[PDB]
Design an enzyme around this catalytic site. Structure first.
Site, short mmCIF file in Angstrom:
data_model
loop_
_atom_site.label_atom_id
_atom_site.label_comp_id
_atom_site.label_asym_id
_atom_site.label_seq_id
_atom_site.Cartn_x
_atom_site.Cartn_y
_atom_site.Cartn_z
N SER A 11 4.33 1.56 8.45
CA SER A 11 3.91 0.61 7.43
C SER A 11 5.09 0.09 6.61
CB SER A 11 2.91 1.28 6.48
OG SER A 11 1.65 1.57 7.09
N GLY A 12 5.05 -1.20 6.28
CA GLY A 12 6.08 -1.84 5.49
C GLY A 12 7.26 -2.34 6.29
N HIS A 29 0.82 -1.21 0.00
CA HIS A 29 0.00 0.00 0.00
C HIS A 29 0.85 1.26 0.00
CE1 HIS A 29 0.33 0.34 4.57
NE2 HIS A 29 0.37 1.61 4.21
N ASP A 77 -6.57 -2.56 -2.81
CA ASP A 77 -6.31 -1.29 -2.14
C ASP A 77 -7.50 -0.78 -1.34
OD1 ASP A 77 -6.24 0.55 -5.31
OD2 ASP A 77 -7.88 -0.48 -4.28
C1 LIG Z 1 -3.09 5.01 -1.08
C2 LIG Z 1 -4.10 4.03 -0.51
C3 LIG Z 1 -5.46 4.27 -1.15
C4 LIG Z 1 -3.64 2.60 -0.79
N1 LIG Z 1 -4.24 4.27 0.94
C5 LIG Z 1 -3.30 4.02 1.89
O1 LIG Z 1 -2.18 3.56 1.64
N2 LIG Z 1 -3.70 4.37 3.15
C6 LIG Z 1 -2.89 4.15 4.35
C7 LIG Z 1 -3.27 2.82 4.95
C8 LIG Z 1 -2.50 2.56 6.23
N3 LIG Z 1 -2.72 3.63 7.20
C9 LIG Z 1 -3.35 3.33 8.36
O2 LIG Z 1 -3.88 2.25 8.53
C10 LIG Z 1 -3.49 4.42 9.43
C11 LIG Z 1 -2.25 4.43 10.34
C12 LIG Z 1 -1.66 3.08 10.65
C13 LIG Z 1 -0.75 2.48 9.78
C14 LIG Z 1 -0.18 1.26 10.09
C15 LIG Z 1 -0.49 0.62 11.27
C16 LIG Z 1 -1.38 1.21 12.17
C17 LIG Z 1 -1.64 0.59 13.49
N4 LIG Z 1 -2.53 1.10 14.29
N5 LIG Z 1 -0.96 -0.48 13.85
C18 LIG Z 1 -1.98 2.42 11.84
N6 LIG Z 1 -4.71 4.18 10.21
S1 LIG Z 1 -6.03 5.07 9.93
O3 LIG Z 1 -5.61 6.44 10.01
O4 LIG Z 1 -7.05 4.59 10.82
C19 LIG Z 1 -6.53 4.74 8.28
C20 LIG Z 1 -6.37 5.71 7.30
C21 LIG Z 1 -6.72 5.41 6.00
C22 LIG Z 1 -7.25 4.16 5.69
C23 LIG Z 1 -7.44 3.20 6.67
C24 LIG Z 1 -8.08 1.89 6.37
C25 LIG Z 1 -7.55 0.70 6.86
C26 LIG Z 1 -8.17 -0.51 6.61
C27 LIG Z 1 -9.34 -0.59 5.86
C28 LIG Z 1 -9.98 -1.92 5.54
O5 LIG Z 1 -11.19 -2.14 6.25
C29 LIG Z 1 -9.85 0.61 5.39
F1 LIG Z 1 -11.02 0.57 4.70
C30 LIG Z 1 -9.25 1.83 5.62
C31 LIG Z 1 -7.07 3.50 7.98
C32 LIG Z 1 -2.33 4.95 6.68
C33 LIG Z 1 -3.07 5.27 5.37
#
Ligand SMILES: CC(C)(C)NC(=O)NC1CCN(C(=O)[C@H](Cc2cccc(C(=N)N)c2)NS(=O)(=O)c2cccc(-c3ccc(CO)c(F)c3)c2)CC1
Ligand SMILES: [Cl-]
Length: 240
Positions: free
Chosen positions: A191-192, A42, A91
């Protein structure tokens, strides 16, 4: 990483920092051979018009401790030849959130740059096992990244518990790791990066930081890609 502490210099020498053109640190990765890194799919998706899928717009820093000291002794800087995203990555759901990054020129192993062992396909990390997450991600939800590499110890969660805590979102490619009382968790920018499982002094990469519902909330543990499932995919695509 929320709720962790400063890593020691040289402590996690397989941890890599991935910088995207004009943006600084964006994601983590892990060193698995002189030429190859494991990361999260991602991180490499075009989005908001920035071409995160363009391997030429990334720089990897190996042997890094402090983001404000990228010319420190022991740091190796590398461009990417290519990004191999898993063909089943989705995604919207984040199923199959894994990618392989090929370095332009090989790393040289040192006290600060060393690979992490892959688990074979039969390797198990049972619910309850304490393992480590590391990265330069945010240290609070809605905060800013850490300059110094952070480490936190977290526990594997039962898969049924994980599914019920994050309903309609957990697939068999995923594992929940953290604490049900929150407090310690990865976050944006981790992430990653690797889950490092320390045993007799052997260390295996257990998984890849993938996503979470916020960071460090109660009953919302971080979600990670399970690495054993991908051993043959790694071998087939990289030779490692
Ligand atoms: C470019 C692209 C379109 C691919 N998006 C991308 O890469 N987004 C990144 C995805 C990954 N990100 C997050 O999950 C973030 C922070 C984070 C990162 C890693 C670990 C942890 C943790 N706590 N260990 C927390 N968490 S968040 O802000 O809640 C958030 C923001 C946007 C989207 C979803 C999300 C997650 C899962 C589902 C499935 O059900 C969903 F529907 C939405 C969560 C950042 C943002
Ligand atoms: Cl504990």
């Amino acid at each position: 990483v929320v709720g962790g502490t400063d890593a020691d210099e040289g402590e996690w020498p397989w941890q890599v920092s991935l910088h995207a053109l004009g943006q600084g640190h964006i994601c983590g990765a892990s060193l698995i051979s002189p030429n190859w890194l494991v990361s999260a799919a991602h991180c490499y998706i075009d989005d908001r018009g920035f071409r995160y899928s363009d391997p030429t717009q990334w720089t990897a820093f190996l042997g890094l401790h402090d983001q404000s000291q990228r010319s420190a002794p022991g740091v190796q800087e590398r461009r990417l030849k290519r990004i191999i995203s898993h063909p089943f990555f989705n995604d919207f759901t984040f199923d199959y959130d894994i990618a392989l990054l090929e370095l332009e020129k090989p790393a040289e192993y040192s006290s600060m740059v060393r690979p992490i062992s892959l688990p074979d396909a039969s390797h198990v990390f049972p619910a309850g096992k304490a393992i480590w997450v590391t990265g330069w991600g945010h240290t609070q939800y809605g905060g800013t990244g850490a300059l110094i590499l952070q480490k936190g110890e977290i526990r594997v969660i039962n898969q049924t518990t994980c599914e019920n805590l994050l309903p309609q979102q957990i697939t068999p490619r995923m594992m929940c790791v953290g604490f049900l009382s929150g407090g310690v968790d990865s976050c944006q920018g981790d992430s990653g990066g690797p889950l490092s499982s320390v045993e007799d002094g052997r260390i295996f990469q257990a998984g890849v930081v993938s996503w979470g519902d916020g960071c460090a909330q109660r009953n919302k543990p971080g979600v990670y890609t399970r690495l054993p499932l991908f051993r043959d995919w790694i071998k087939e695509n990289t030779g490692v």
